[PDB]
């Protein structure tokens, strides 16, 4: 509502002394503060879920799936704690946009892979390969 | 004076002016002074005009994009396999003990992560940022 | 098995984070400072992760229990 999305052609912002080297860059707003603001709520959910996992270690094993949850949360927190310095360190660079895009996509793929694998793959393996104990 | 050279006249003698080539980001339309091309475009080779600065983006065939796209395809295939496996064996005790509904929500989240990798790679044409 | 897996995972994350911060920099006067600090902190972090995940629990049990 506040501001509809629009594209920006940075015809400048990379002006060099050689007129041949001049290049415009096609982008769409999406400044760094926007990325941080859009990811903040999910990161807060992450942190509180990890807090509850820390607070719930130790179970009569009737409540299974707590132990895999702990590993998933620790792994994901490590991923994003590593992500932050890369975003704040390549801010002034000649190829900032490529690195930031690749970093964000790789981080999200890694998080999804960790959750999917470590919470579902044993079950699939048992279901197909060992139907006797399903 | 040749094209791209600027004329300056010695006082007292209308003849034998001086020529001057101006600078990189200037073009000479007056034949006595050279103007400046705006930020959008760039001085022409002849030094009396302007040419548009090329625009660059992120392209699908670059090394910056081949790796995330590969990972996204592999992950999407794996998640689809898992979802279908759960769908076929919906009544089995393991799936019933997995917490079915929230498991489906989590699977949707994983699928969305791979899809957003695709979106971020794709292109800047307004609706994509939406 | 679990400590070794955790150690590998954390070290791999550290070095994959090191590569873009190190090889892409503002190409300015403070480039040597940034590169040196990044390298040294990464190496120390890897060493500390190995020491913590392989030896600290055993020492804790030996001394305090
Ligand atoms: O994105 C990550 N890691 C990464 C690794 C290599 C990369 O490749 C390049 C290529 C050239 C230059 Cl100058 C710089 N980096 C790039 Cl962009 C990124 C990452 C690593 C750990 C956790 C989360 N995310």
Curated annotation (Swiss-Prot), chain A:
Cytoplasmic side: 55-67
Positions of transmembrane segments: 33-54, 68-89, 105-129
Sequence ranges on the Extracellular membrane side: 3-32, 90-104
Subcellular location: Cell membrane
Family designation: Belongs to the G-protein coupled receptor 3 family.
Function: G-protein coupled receptor for glutamate. Ligand binding causes a conformation change that triggers signaling via guanine nucleotide-binding proteins (G proteins) and modulates the activity of down-stream effectors, such as adenylate cyclase. Signaling inhibits adenylate cyclase activity.
Subunit and interaction comment: Interacts with PICK1.
Annotated protein name in UniProt: Metabotropic glutamate receptor 8
Taxonomic lineage: Eukaryota, Metazoa, Chordata, Craniata, Vertebrata
Segment of the intact protein contained: 715 to 848 of 908
From Swiss-Prot, chain C:
Record topology, Extracellular segments: 25-39
Protein location: Cell membrane
Domain of life of the organism encoding this protein: Eukaryota
Transmembrane segment boundaries: 3-24, 40-64
Quaternary state and interactors: Interacts with PICK1.
Function: G-protein coupled receptor for glutamate. Ligand binding causes a conformation change that triggers signaling via guanine nucleotide-binding proteins (G proteins) and modulates the activity of down-stream effectors, such as adenylate cyclase. Signaling inhibits adenylate cyclase activity.
UniProt record similarity statement: Belongs to the G-protein coupled receptor 3 family.
Entry protein name: Metabotropic glutamate receptor 8
Organism of provenance: Homo sapiens
Recorded name of the encoding gene: GRM8
Range within the parent protein: 780 to 844 of 908
